[PDB]
Amino acid sequence: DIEADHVGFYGTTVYQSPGDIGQYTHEFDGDELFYVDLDKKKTVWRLPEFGQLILFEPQGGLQNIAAEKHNLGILTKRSNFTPATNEAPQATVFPKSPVLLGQPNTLICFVDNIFPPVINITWLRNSKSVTDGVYETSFLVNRDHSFHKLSYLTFIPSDDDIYDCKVEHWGLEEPVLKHWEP
Amino acid sequence: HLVERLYLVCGGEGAGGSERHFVHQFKGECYFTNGTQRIRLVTRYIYNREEYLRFDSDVGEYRAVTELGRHSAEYYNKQYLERTRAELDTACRHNYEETEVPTSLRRLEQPNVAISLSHNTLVCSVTDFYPAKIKVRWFRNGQEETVGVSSTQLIRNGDWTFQVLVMLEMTPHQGEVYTCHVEHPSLKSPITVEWRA
Ligand SMILES: *[C@@H]1O[C@H](CO)[C@@H](O[C@@H]2O[C@H](CO)[C@@H](O)[C@H](O)[C@H]2NC(C)=O)[C@H](O)[C@H]1NC(C)=O
Numbered sequence A: 001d002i003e004a005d006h007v008g009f010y011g012t013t014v015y016q017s018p019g020d021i022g023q024y025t026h027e028f029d030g031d032e033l034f035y036v037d038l039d040k041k042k043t044v045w046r047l048p049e050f051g052q053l054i055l056f057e058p059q060g061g062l063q064n065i066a067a068e069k070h071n072l073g074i075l076t077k078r079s080n081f082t083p084a085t086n087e088a089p090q091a092t093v094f095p096k097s098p099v100l101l102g103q104p105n106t107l108i109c110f111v112d113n114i115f116p117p118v119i120n121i122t123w124l125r126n127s128k129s130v131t132d133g134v135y136e137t138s139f140l141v142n143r144d145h146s147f148h149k150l151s152y153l154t155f156i157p158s159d160d161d162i163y164d165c166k167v168e169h170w171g172l173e174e175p176v177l178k179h180w181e182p
Numbered sequence B: 001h002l003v004e005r006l007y008l009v010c011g012g013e014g015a016g017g018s019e020r021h022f023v024h025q026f027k028g029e030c031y032f033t034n035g036t037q038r039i040r041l042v043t044r045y046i047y048n049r050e051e052y053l054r055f056d057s058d059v060g061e062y063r064a065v066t067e068l069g070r071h072s073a074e075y076y077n078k079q080y081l082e083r084t085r086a087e088l089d090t091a092c093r094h095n096y097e098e099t100e101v102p103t104s105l106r107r108l109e110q111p112n113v114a115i116s117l118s119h120n121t122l123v124c125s126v127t128d129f130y131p132a133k134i135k136v137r138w139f140r141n142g143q144e145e146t147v148g149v150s151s152t153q154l155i156r157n158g159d160w161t162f163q164v165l166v167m168l169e170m171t172p173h174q175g176e177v178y179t180c181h182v183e184h185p186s187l188k189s190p191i192t193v194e195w196r197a
């Protein structure tokens, strides 16, 4: 492991086929700066104040993805069409800040060992699905070339309210729920 | 005026639940030590989970990491060798000095601190802070505890804040004062929280 004060990933690219699924991000010290929406051709900053002084031309993401489409084709053939292995992801749920009755908070679902980078993370309150107040990060790179990902649910902590983080992935026979209560 | 973030160029080679898939990845990594005094550039080309080709500026050229990349390294060294070398300055150094210095490295998020009880154990919750460097200390009637002290790993929230939990092994007596004491770059003086038996 290389010793450094800081690490920028100024170019993280992934592409897979079939399905034409791809992602381009920048990170600094392990946090996402932005991803380029490759279909809308625009830069989407993790926090909106990142882009108030700084610009990233989406074309750089387009450059990387086109090169990776090409590289995927060549290396697939050179490997004698060795397919990727579907991993089984694993999830941990924890609160953003200490849980206090009636005080708005955020429940965080951290999901690791994601490969290939295609997944569903959804939330359940009292076994009923919740779509409001949900944000999800990009696929963030791991040293072993798998990925991790976080989903965020805004909630008001109450008495015996019950949450599950539900993960579905090709490497899972059935969706895994990760439970959580105060 | 707006400043531009630059990127490391992905060089190109020459020329579903049960469906097979095939994955490729490119990673452009800039390692900084003491600002931009030491920079190290490492770019990686990966098929599925196998990194096969790497540029490492401590080496100075592309090298095959595995046999799959034996001929890739010879092509990339012919086509992109000195372009990639120059990226150490045109991309890594520029991005640090012109874009990280005014943003990522000026970010300061002060921790929040709360004590609660779980012999017994006090839990000091230190949350919502950035950057990662922090020191947490426990004291008992004005004297620092060092034995009986454990913490979780640093938790990365993904939203550019961290948290950590720091636990004290303790038996409550008398009217003692336990204090959780937090030092952090966002804080000119420590934040403290007192808990009384
Ligand atoms: C993520 O969720 C979507 C929606 O639930 C899945 O897509 C559906 O998959 C079912 C499974 O049999 C199909 O019958 C539907 O036709 C699909 N609907 C839509 C709208 O896509 C998707 O497969 C999930 N992904 C993973 C990896 O499990």
Ligand SMILES: *[C@@H]1O[C@H](CO)[C@@H](O)[C@H](O)[C@H]1NC(C)=O
Pocket: A080
């Ligand atoms: C290529 O892969 C096929 C499919 O598994 C295998 O049967 C064969 O041995 C391989 N052939 C060569 C020439 O590598």
